[PDB]
Amino acid sequence: MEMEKEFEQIDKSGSWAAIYQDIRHEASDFPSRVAKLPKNKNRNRYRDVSPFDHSRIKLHQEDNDYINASLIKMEEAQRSYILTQGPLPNTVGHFWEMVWEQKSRGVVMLNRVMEKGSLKCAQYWPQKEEKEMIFEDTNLKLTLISEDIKSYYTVRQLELENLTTQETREILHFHYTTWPDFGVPESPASFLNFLFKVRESGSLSPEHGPVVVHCSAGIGRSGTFCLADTCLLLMDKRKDPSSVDIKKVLLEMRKFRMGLIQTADQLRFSYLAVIEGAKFIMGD
Numbered sequence: 209m210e211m212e213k214e215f216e217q218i219d220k221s222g223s224w225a226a227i228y229q230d231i232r233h234e235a236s237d238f239p240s241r242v243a244k245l246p247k248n249k250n251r252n253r254y255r256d257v258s259p260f261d262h263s264r265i266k267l268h269q270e271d272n273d274y275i276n277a278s279l280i281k282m283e284e285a286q287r288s289y290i291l292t293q294g295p296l297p298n299t300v301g302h303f304w305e306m307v308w309e310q311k312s313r314g315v316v317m318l319n320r321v322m323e324k325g326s327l328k329c330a331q332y333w334p335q336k337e338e339k340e341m342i343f344e345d346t347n348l349k350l351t352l353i354s355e356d357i358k359s360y361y362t363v364r365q366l367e368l369e370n371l372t373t374q375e376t377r378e379i380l381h382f383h384y385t386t387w388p389d390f391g392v393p394e395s396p397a398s399f400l401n402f403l404f405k406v407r408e409s410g411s412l413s414p415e416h417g418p419v420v421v422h423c424s425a426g427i428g429r430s431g432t433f434c435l436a437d438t439c440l441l442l443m444d445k446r447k448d449p450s451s452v453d454i455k456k457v458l459l460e461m462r463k464f465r466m467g468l469i470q471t472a473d474q475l476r477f478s479y480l481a482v483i484e485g486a487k488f489i490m491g492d
């Protein structure tokens with residue numbers, strides 16, 4: 209079926225939970241043996257969220273190459289993404305090592321450091337220009353260059369230096385600051401505006417390594433971001449945009465990381481975002 213009318217048909221019939229459970233039943237199951245080794249327990253935020261072995265990102269280190277991160281490679285859309293958990297106190301250095309080694313331009317953050325009165329990820333970037341951060345375990349230096357605070361999101365320019373070679377690179381940090389503590393946003397308008405700002409920066413384009421995207425577990429909000437982006441790109445590429453099937457795209461993405469889209473409300477929100485976003489692209 210088309211998307212917008214499949215949407216009204218699920219709303220009127222109140223069957224979002226049943227649609228979402230079908231997806232969960234059909235989703236791929238692949239081994240994640242490296243994630244579950246005992247030496248990696250303090251590298252995982254949640255015991256039930258792990259990268260598959262076949263698609264995990266490897267750190268370029270011979271001691272321990274493990275990070276909780278997956279490469280989502282979308283062949284028809286010609287887009288790639290790295291989805292990862294919010295960094296932990298003992299993985300902030302690994303996180304920036306990955307950004308460096310994979311040649312990423314942008315980092316997309318969809319959570320606040322504290323939500324619901326608890327810590328959802330480490331404070332992994334510097335908050336003042338004159339107070340830079342040094343990660344001694346991976347030999348990197350990170351400096352805040354500039355910061356632009358808007359009503360729904362903040363963009364930061366960061367300088368990452370590889371202290372071993374003295375090479376430097378500019379990284380863009382896109383921080384969506386207004387996702388609610390419970391539920392999903394009422395309107396997708398600010399999320400779509402944010403997605404378009406990431407796109408306009410070059411961070412999603414083939415001349416760079418894959419964008420790094422995260423929330424707390426790296427599957428829920430993060431899944432919503434890449435699902436909406438890929439669906440809108442396919443609608444631009446194809447002769448028949450109504451042929452884009454969001455449930456099929458989501459199942460393709462779940463071949464590469466488990467659990468993408470965590471609730472039936474996130475699924476409904478993803479439909480809403482793609483539907484509204486397709487009107488703004490055109491041709492309007």
Ligand SMILES: Cn1nc(-c2cccs2)cc1N
Nearest residue numbers: 353365366367377378379380
């Ligand atoms: C002056 N300047 N500007 C930068 C960055 C630009 C864009 C991202 S980071 C780094 C330095 N040293």
